[PDB]
Amino acid sequence: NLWERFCNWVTSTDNRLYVGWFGVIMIPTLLAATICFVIAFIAAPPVDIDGIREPVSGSLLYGNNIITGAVVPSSNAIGLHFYPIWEAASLDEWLYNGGPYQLIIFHFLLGASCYMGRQWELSYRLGMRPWICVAYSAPLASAFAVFLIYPIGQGSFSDGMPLGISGTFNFMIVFQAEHNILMHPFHQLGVAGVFGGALFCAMHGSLVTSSLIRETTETESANYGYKFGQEEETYNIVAAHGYFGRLIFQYASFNNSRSLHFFLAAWPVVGVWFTALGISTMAFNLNGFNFNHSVIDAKGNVINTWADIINRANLGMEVMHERNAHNFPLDLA
Amino acid sequence: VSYPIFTVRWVAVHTLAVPTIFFLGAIAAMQFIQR
Amino acid sequence: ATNRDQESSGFAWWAGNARLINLSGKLLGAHVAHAGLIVFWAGAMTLFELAHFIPEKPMYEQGLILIPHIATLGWGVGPGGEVVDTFPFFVVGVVHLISSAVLGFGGVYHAIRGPETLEEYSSFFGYDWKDKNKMTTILGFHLIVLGIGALLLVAKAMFFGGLYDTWAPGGGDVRVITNPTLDPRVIFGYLLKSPFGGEGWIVSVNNLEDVVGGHIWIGLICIAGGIWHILTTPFGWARRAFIWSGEAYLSYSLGALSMMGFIATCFVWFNNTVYPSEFYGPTGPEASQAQAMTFLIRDQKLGANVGSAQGPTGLGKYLMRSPTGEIIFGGETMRFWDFRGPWLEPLRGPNGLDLNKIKNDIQPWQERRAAEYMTHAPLGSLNSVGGVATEINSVNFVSPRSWLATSHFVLAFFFLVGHLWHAGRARAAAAGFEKGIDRESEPVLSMPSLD
Amino acid sequence: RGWFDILDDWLKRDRFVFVGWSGILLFPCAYLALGGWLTGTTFVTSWYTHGLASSYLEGCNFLTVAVSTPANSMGHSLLLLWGPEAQGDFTRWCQLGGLWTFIALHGAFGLIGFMLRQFEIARLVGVRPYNAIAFSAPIAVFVSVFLIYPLGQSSWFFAPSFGVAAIFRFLLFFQGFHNWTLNPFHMMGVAGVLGGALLCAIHGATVENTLFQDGEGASTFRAFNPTQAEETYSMVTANRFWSQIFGIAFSNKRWLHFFMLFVPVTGLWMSAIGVVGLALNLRSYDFISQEIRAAEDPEFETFYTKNLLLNEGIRAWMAPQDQPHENFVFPEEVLPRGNAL
Amino acid sequence: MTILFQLALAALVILSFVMVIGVPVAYASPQDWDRSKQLIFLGSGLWIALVLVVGVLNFFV
Amino acid sequence: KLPEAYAIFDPLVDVLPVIPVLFLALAFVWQAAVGFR
Amino acid sequence: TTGERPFSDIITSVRYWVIHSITIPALFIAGWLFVSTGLAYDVFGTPRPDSYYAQEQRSIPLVTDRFEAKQQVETFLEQL
Amino acid sequence: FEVIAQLTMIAMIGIAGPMIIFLLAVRRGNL
Amino acid sequence: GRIPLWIVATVAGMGVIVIVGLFFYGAYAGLGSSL
Ligand code: CLA
Ligand code: CLA
Ligand code: CLA
Ligand code: CLA
Ligand code: CLA
Ligand SMILES: CC1=C(/C=C/C(C)=C/C=C/C(C)=C/C=C/C=C(C)/C=C/C=C(C)/C=C/C2=C(C)CCCC2(C)C)C(C)(C)CCC1
Ligand SMILES: CC1=C(/C=C/C(C)=C/C=C/C(C)=C/C=C/C=C(C)/C=C/C=C(C)/C=C/C2=C(C)CCCC2(C)C)C(C)(C)CCC1
Numbered sequence A: 001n002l003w004e005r006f007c008n009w010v011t012s013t014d015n016r017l018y019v020g021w022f023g024v025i026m027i028p029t030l031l032a033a034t035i036c037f038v039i040a041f042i043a044a045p046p047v048d049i050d051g052i053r054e055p056v057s058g059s060l061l062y063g064n065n066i067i068t069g070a071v072v073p074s075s076n077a078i079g080l081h082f083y084p085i086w087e088a089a090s091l092d093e094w095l096y097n098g099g100p101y102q103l104i105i106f107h108f109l110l111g112a113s114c115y116m117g118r119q120w121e122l123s124y125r126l127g128m129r130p131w132i133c134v135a136y137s138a139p140l141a142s143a144f145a146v147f148l149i150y151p152i153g154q155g156s157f158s159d160g161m162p163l164g165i166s167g168t169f170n171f172m173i174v175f176q177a178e179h180n181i182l183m184h185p186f187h188q189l190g191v192a193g194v195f196g197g198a199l200f201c202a203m204h205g206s207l208v209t210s211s212l213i214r215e216t217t218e219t220e221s222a223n224y225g226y227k228f229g230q231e232e233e234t235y236n237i238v239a240a241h242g243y244f245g246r247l248i249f250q251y252a253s254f255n256n257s258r259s260l261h262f263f264l265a266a267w268p269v270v271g272v273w274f275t276a277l278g279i280s281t282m283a284f285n286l287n288g289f290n291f292n293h294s295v296i297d298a299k300g301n302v303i304n305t306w307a308d309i310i311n312r313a314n315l316g317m318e319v320m321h322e323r324n325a326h327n328f329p330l331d332l333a
Numbered sequence B: 001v002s003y004p005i006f007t008v009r010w011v012a013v014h015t016l017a018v019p020t021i022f023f024l025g026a027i028a029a030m031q032f033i034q035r
Numbered sequence C: 001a002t003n004r005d006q007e008s009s010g011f012a013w014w015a016g017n018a019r020l021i022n023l024s025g026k027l028l029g030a031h032v033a034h035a036g037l038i039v040f041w042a043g044a045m046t047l048f049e050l051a052h053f054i055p056e057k058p059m060y061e062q063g064l065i066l067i068p069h070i071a072t073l074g075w076g077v078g079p080g081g082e083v084v085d086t087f088p089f090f091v092v093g094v095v096h097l098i099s100s101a102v103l104g105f106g107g108v109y110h111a112i113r114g115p116e117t118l119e120e121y122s123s124f125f126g127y128d129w130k131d132k133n134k135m136t137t138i139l140g141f142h143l144i145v146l147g148i149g150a151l152l153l154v155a156k157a158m159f160f161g162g163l164y165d166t167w168a169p170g171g172g173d174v175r176v177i178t179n180p181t182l183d184p185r186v187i188f189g190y191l192l193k194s195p196f197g198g199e200g201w202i203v204s205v206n207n208l209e210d211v212v213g214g215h216i217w218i219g220l221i222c223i224a225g226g227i228w229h230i231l232t233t234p235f236g237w238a239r240r241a242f243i244w245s246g247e248a249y250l251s252y253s254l255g256a257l258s259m260m261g262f263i264a265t266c267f268v269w270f271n272n273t274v275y276p277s278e279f280y281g282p283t284g285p286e287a288s289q290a291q292a293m294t295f296l297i298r299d300q301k302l303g304a305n306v307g308s309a310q311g312p313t314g315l316g317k318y319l320m321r322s323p324t325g326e327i328i329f330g331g332e333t334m335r336f337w338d339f340r341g342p343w344l345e346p347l348r349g350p351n352g353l354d355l356n357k358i359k360n361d362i363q364p365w366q367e368r369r370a371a372e373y374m375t376h377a378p379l380g381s382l383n384s385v386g387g388v389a390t391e392i393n394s395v396n397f398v399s400p401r402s403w404l405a406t407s408h409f410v411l412a413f414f415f416l417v418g419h420l421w422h423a424g425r426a427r428a429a430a431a432g433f434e435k436g437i438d439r440e441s442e443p444v445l446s447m448p449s450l451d
Numbered sequence D: 001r002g003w004f005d006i007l008d009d010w011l012k013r014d015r016f017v018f019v020g021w022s023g024i025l026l027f028p029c030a031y032l033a034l035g036g037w038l039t040g041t042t043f044v045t046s047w048y049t050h051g052l053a054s055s056y057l058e059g060c061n062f063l064t065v066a067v068s069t070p071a072n073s074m075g076h077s078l079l080l081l082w083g084p085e086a087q088g089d090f091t092r093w094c095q096l097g098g099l100w101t102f103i104a105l106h107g108a109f110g111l112i113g114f115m116l117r118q119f120e121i122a123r124l125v126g127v128r129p130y131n132a133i134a135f136s137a138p139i140a141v142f143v144s145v146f147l148i149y150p151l152g153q154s155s156w157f158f159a160p161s162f163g164v165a166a167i168f169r170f171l172l173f174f175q176g177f178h179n180w181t182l183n184p185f186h187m188m189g190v191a192g193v194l195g196g197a198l199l200c201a202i203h204g205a206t207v208e209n210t211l212f213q214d215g216e217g218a219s220t221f222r223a224f225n226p227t228q229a230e231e232t233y234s235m236v237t238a239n240r241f242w243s244q245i246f247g248i249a250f251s252n253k254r255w256l257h258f259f260m261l262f263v264p265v266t267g268l269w270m271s272a273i274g275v276v277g278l279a280l281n282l283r284s285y286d287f288i289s290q291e292i293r294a295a296e297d298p299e300f301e302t303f304y305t306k307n308l309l310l311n312e313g314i315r316a317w318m319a320p321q322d323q324p325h326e327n328f329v330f331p332e333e334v335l336p337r338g339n340a341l
Numbered sequence E: 001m002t003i004l005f006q007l008a009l010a011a012l013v014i015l016s017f018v019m020v021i022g023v024p025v026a027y028a029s030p031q032d033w034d035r036s037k038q039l040i041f042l043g044s045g046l047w048i049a050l051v052l053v054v055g056v057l058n059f060f061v
Numbered sequence F: 001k002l003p004e005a006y007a008i009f010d011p012l013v014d015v016l017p018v019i020p021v022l023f024l025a026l027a028f029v030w031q032a033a034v035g036f037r
Numbered sequence G: 001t002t003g004e005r006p007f008s009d010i011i012t013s014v015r016y017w018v019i020h021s022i023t024i025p026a027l028f029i030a031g032w033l034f035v036s037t038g039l040a041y042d043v044f045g046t047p048r049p050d051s052y053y054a055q056e057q058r059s060i061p062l063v064t065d066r067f068e069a070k071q072q073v074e075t076f077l078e079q080l
Numbered sequence H: 001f002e003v004i005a006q007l008t009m010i011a012m013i014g015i016a017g018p019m020i021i022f023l024l025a026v027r028r029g030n031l
Numbered sequence I: 001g002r003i004p005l006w007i008v009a010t011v012a013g014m015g016v017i018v019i020v021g022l023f024f025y026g027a028y029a030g031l032g033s034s035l
């Protein structure tokens, strides 16, 4: 049976890269998104992102470098309308209105969801515990928040994050202008997540490296003291625990390697979950804390705080962003 | 048994805890200040 | 203490509810007590909202998420969403509170006093997760109950007073639905619509006839499926496709609930039919369109020609064309040209917005509605300061659409995470490696090298 | 045996809190830095240095309290309590921003004391001192941001104030005036921090999901004993999983954990170098080719030019209140604005 | 009879508090389960009767 | 507002919604009473 | 395991609470009275809500000189 | 006066929970 | 003479909850309330 042989090949763990059924979806979508991204980043013509006939050039051939180049989001006139190639009268019209962005982000989001499913699938085929995909759900939720959920809440894929470095910075600055994300607790939890993730990464790495058991001489690298597949632990967990328990106090230190590695998984994953949820909840315009004119003296004069200085910076960004796109006093979306 | 009382741990605990409770009382009083 | 520690159960305290997996009586107690919690929140929150309710002020200015649900059903409201009697709100709240006392009594009784396992007490109420017939029978009972609930919504719409209709002629009013759409073409064409802009899938249902007909179909389909699962055993393909265990069934429900939470978020954000703007406030698209309408009216009263006015970029300042040719509002609200609202449709002709009806047929109630919806846009801070993030502290407003959409996106995402967690764990536990790799029989050691 | 040796024995005694020789530097300085911050954010205003309320006593919350930097007219004065500005008066010292320099200097010497504590405990316990070497990167960040950056600028005023919203102001200032996102050293810092968070999450999840079954409990944390000799998880299974999912995988545990050390430390050091450059206003503000093209061609727009317009808005709208010593009076007509809004 | 209705509702609140504390205590203390069974049965009956009385008196006040 | 005959019970209504949150907290109290076994 | 009495042994004892039911409320009341008697304003120089501005001024009192800053703040306070 | 009634109501509810736990602990109940 | 540790933990957590709720109450009242 050809179908049985195909099923055996798809689910085979002997392939150099595992495919699986999630990979059967993942490989074509990510290949399409990757090829279209490379082509658009090099050679796409300028895109009228704001829908006001003001095309923004994001490709290398139209005057960009690596830093300033981007795949520009689709037109504000399109909004949330589905804009495939066959909906356009020609490829010139599709390129003018930012169709490549919609193609890339839709294929990428599908392929990355199937990447998460593929991680589960391979863990199941290898007899592993299944929750690496749960850890990967945090950056995937972040990608969904900036590419899909924020355009949905704001009503246009033009407000999605551009596929570029300076476009990303533009997204960040305009987002702070419109939503005050720095004062949002979910973004603060995300900063705690990534700062703590970097801290605990450096901490765990330095504590394991500090307690490596002497297996080599002074000339060779210490990494040759570990052999792949060896049964014994390559470092002294008790010595690292003794060091770190004397560094703070005994009960702030993990003596359990499993609890420590669960904490290493859990802290940045939960923090990034919260910051992705912050982006989505601000997509429905539930913004960060507003303390403008909160402190008032006895007469009634406004006493400024640091929040008022942040408000001045946000006002500068707000009045300069998309400088020709607004006709009315309130930036309602 | 025969544990001591005034150790280094006692000093560290109280140098953190005594001003903490004092400051908490101060801020709790601040909550009832009008313009 | 039966199964109430880690040594006997294998689960720590932080996974202590997993000790209830094979204890049907205590698990039933946990479920009934939790249902009592849900009903308690419904009743207590309704009474809390009613105690601070100012009936002349709009509902969406008062932080209400439950009174708008009762008002949409037609209880306590008149024309234009005006509250005429707060007593149905009180009745709903107190009946939920008392029923929650009853459910809490039952949950506590089955949790700590009743038999730990129901199998010895009753073959009917006892169950085993591996018995697929019993699982389908319980699913069939619950499907019949859900179908009866959908028919109860239909009965409210058709016989017991009707529903609030924001599209009723002459402003929104409570209307009895006498001709529900029973045509399967319309109902399942809603089911087959695109989810993208201008189509909106099932979120785009814009009349109560379609809502009531869809609930007639949903109730009949749920009752038929309930009878089907009571009378039939799962087939061979279903038996080979699923994991048959309690955690597996939980993970399936978690995925379903995550999808429903995402759909409810989109429903409350975009739909102004089953979430009337009289109660929930304007949608985001509605408020942007309202701002464009407001300044078109103001400048037309000053003598401007709104059809020939040219914005900074050369597009029309007030009126432009959608990519398919429709005459739409200009500015950034060009993204929201698929918005339909009862205050805007009188100005729409076959080719979109009509210049003559704009010039001559804009009523004062439409100008009032546009100004009100422009100044109550669903934008605000976490500490409930109305407006954009750069606004000062004077307006205490966050739209209930914002609260509902944000809260249910958070819940839907976390339930997707829970679905992934429990689906992976159910698969690993069915295959037998959820506790880790066997040292003696590690599978990768029996596999050839990749290179 | 000698008073030095007896004092050494007492300092290195096993305790709940280790003291050591480094404790003499660490505990007073760290305690005074933390106490100065709590005291300043609870009781001390910024009304005479910035024109701001910054304490709980004035009505600020946890996000908006700060110990603010001294006034720009202080220059880089150490602002000692007995110095020529305060002249021994504690109240005037608090009103002039002396708590900021108090916290900054005591925090710097406390960070020195903590790294010396890391060295001393590593020497006593008998381990390699890689934790102190890793802690060199937070020290580099603190020295570059809180000391070197204001020293390169006109005064302590442009250093970060010790507060949440004040740090947010510092971020937005660096965007508006320095275009700090465009700086490649900050980009390397971001790569290091996000890669460290990624490595932390991925290594924790990989270890937790390649565990060996060493007990019958469905919660696996009890299946580890600290004195055990065998590895608690399967490195071979983890390697095969990541080789087939991602293409590459670690095969050396020691190299993996050194890499976990290496990524965020290197990122923080690169960002500190960029902050030194910004101390001298040596910014990566602009690309000259793009600006020549945009000056000669009014149809050429990129995301970088839009970011430059946003920076102009930040500077013009922020400067009169963020820099009150300059006495900026920007009339309404000179403020750069887009249409409407 | 606003005073009578308020007395009935206050009694319902007091009895609800008493039942909220006593029902788990009686259910979880197995060495009192003769008297506490009848106390719970009487309290449940009285609570239901008070709920019905409060509803009727609401319609009369 | 509530119906007038219930106005004397208005403070109690004001604290009714937070009761489910306490239930979650109650679980931890109960676990602490049994030593988190 | 360091020769000190365990924290759980200490905080569950009655002598601890005999001492600390006195000391903890005394410190809390001391902080409360430190604020409510207005002493914190005197100690730290923090303005009261009626002490930010004079009655008809809107200019913020900002320190503009280094070695006369103490006198400038004193002059600000003399202007109420 | 209204907030005093609110605080005493929430105090009695939030003590009623731990009161149940305390009564079951002192009576050696099945807690 | 042993107060149970769960009682101490419950009372301390209730005190923390009361202090935090007081701080949020003061966020809506008096200084810093924008009123
Ligand atoms: C919706 C929340 C919810 C519900 C319904 C349950 C329900 C249950 N859990 Mg549980 N649990 C929860 C949350 C919840 N849990 C959380 C958040 C945690 C983490 C801390 C745990 C941790 C946990 C562990 C570790 C264990 C359970 C166990 C149990 C079961 C037996 C409990 C028992 O023996 O009581 C004993 C407790 C008491 C007798 C104290 C009194 C409790 C009563 C019910 C208080 C009622 C208060 C209320 C106001 C009364 C109203 C009455 C009125 C209507 C008349 C029970 C079905 C156990 C189990 O599986 O048993 C096999 C078990 O070992 N749970
Ligand atoms: C209908 C939904 C549902 C149901 C029935 C279950 C049922 C179960 N889950 Mg599960 N879960 C769900 C949704 C659900 N889950 C979701 C949505 C997620 C994603 C976050 C998870 C993630 C999850 C994990 C990671 C694990 C479980 C586990 C379990 C088992 C034991 C749970 C336990 O004792 O918790 C005890 C309860 C607690 C310890 C309390 C947790 C406190 C939460 C996280 C904070 C809540 C904050 C609150 C909402 C807001 C603030 C309140 C304020 C007072 C501070 C049990 C079978 C465990 C398992 O696999 O066992 C086999 C396990 O390890 N669940
Ligand atoms: C999910 C709900 C549910 C389920 C499946 C059960 C199941 C069971 N209960 Mg239980 N119970 C519940 C809720 C539930 N209970 C509640 C809420 C209470 C509080 C009132 C009780 C109080 C209770 C007691 C005191 C006892 C049981 C007993 C039993 C067992 C035998 C009952 C029997 O023979 O049928 C009897 C069937 C009936 C009396 C028919 C009732 C039909 C009702 C009134 C119609 C209601 C309409 C609709 C279905 C519900 C509307 C509410 C809805 C909107 C939520 C069985 C395991 C007994 C037991 O375990 O013995 C050892 C026992 O002594 N239960
Ligand atoms: C809560 C609702 C519920 C649940 C959990 C189940 C559960 C089950 N049903 Mg079932 N059923 C229900 C309601 C429900 N039923 C109702 C209301 C009816 C009446 C119409 C039926 C009629 C019914 C029949 C006739 C059969 C089942 C069967 C089954 C079993 C296999 C399910 C399966 O593999 O389908 C999973 C779904 C698929 C395999 C479909 C393919 C997946 C497509 C591609 C998904 C596309 C949808 C996508 C998400 C987009 C959504 C929008 C879309 C509508 C455009 C399972 C026990 C089977 C069985 O064994 O019964 C004995 C069977 O033959 N059901
Ligand atoms: C060991 C811990 C330690 C360290 C390293 C520091 C370090 C510092 N403190 Mg500090 N401090 C400490 C503990 C510490 N403190 C404690 C415990 C308190 C509470 C009492 C304070 C209270 C405090 C205040 C209130 C202030 C400082 C300040 C300072 C800074 C400037 C100090 C200065 O210029 O004098 C340097 C002095 C010496 C190095 C002493 C030299 C001694 C050697 C042995 C020479 C011998 C002298 C000789 C015997 C006497 C000569 C007699 C005659 C000829 C004069 C500096 C960073 C100031 C500050 O932060 O400014 C913003 C400030 O205002 N400190
Ligand atoms: C098992 C368990 C659990 C749980 C439990 C639960 C969850 C329960 C529930 C419960 C419930 C769920 C309950 C309820 C109750 C209720 C009540 C008791 C009520 C009553 C009512 C009333 C009394 C009313 C009144 C009134 C009216 C009439 C009107 C006006 C107003 C007022 C309010 C006055 C836990 C977690 C702890 C853990 C352990 C075990
Ligand atoms: C009420 C209403 C309505 C109606 C509605 C309806 C009529 C509905 C229906 C609906 C439906 C009718 C739905 C369905 C769904 C389905 C689903 C959701 C599915 C799922 C699936 C799954 C999950 C699968 C899975 C799988 C695969 C993938 C393969 C193999 C394996 C397994 C089996 C696992 C309307 C809108 C008109 C209006 C409004 C109101």
Ligand SMILES: CC1=C(/C=C/C(C)=C/C=C/C(C)=C/C=C/C=C(C)/C=C/C=C(C)/C=C/C2=C(C)CCCC2(C)C)C(C)(C)CCC1
Pocket: B015, B016, B019, B020, B023, B024, D031, D032, D034, D035, D036, D038, D039, I016, I020
């Ligand atoms: C500067 C100065 C000084 C010093 C002083 C001091 C050293 C002080 C201290 C102070 C202190 C030492 C204070 C403390 C404070 C504390 C507080 C105020 C606390 C708070 C807390 C809280 C509020 C909590 C929270 C939390 C978290 C964090 C998370 C979870 C949840 C909870 C809620 C638990 C002297 C005279 C020497 C010299 C001159 C200058």
Ligand SMILES: CC1=C(/C=C/C(C)=C/C=C/C(C)=C/C=C/C=C(C)/C=C/C=C(C)/C=C/C2=C(C)CCCC2(C)C)C(C)(C)CCC1
Pocket: E013, E014, E016, E017, E018, E020, F012, F016, F019, F022, F023, F025, F026, F028, F029, F032, H013, H014, H015, H016, H017, H018, I006, I009, I010, I011, I012, I013, I014
């Ligand atoms: C409707 C109503 C009612 C009802 C009520 C109820 C149903 C209640 C319940 C209640 C409850 C149910 C309560 C509870 C509470 C609780 C609490 C208040 C707790 C807290 C907690 C804490 C504080 C914790 C702590 C801890 C532990 C112990 C361990 C770990 C650590 C920590 C520290 C976290 C009555 C009858 C009045 C009448 C009228 C109306």
Ligand code: OEX
Pocket: A050, A076, A154, A158, A159, A174, A178, A321, A322, A325, A331, A332, A333, C332
């Ligand atoms: O597109 Mn992108 O950013 Ca959201 O706000 Mn409206 O639209 Mn436009 O302005 Mn602002």
Ligand SMILES: [Cl-]
Pocket: A170, A174, A320, A321, A322, A323, D306
């Ligand atoms: Cl922009």
Ligand SMILES: [Cl-]
Pocket: A325, A326, A327, A328, C330, C331, C332, C333
């Ligand atoms: Cl506009």
Ligand SMILES: [Fe+2]
Pocket: A204, A208, A261, D203, D207, D257
């Ligand atoms: Fe590790």
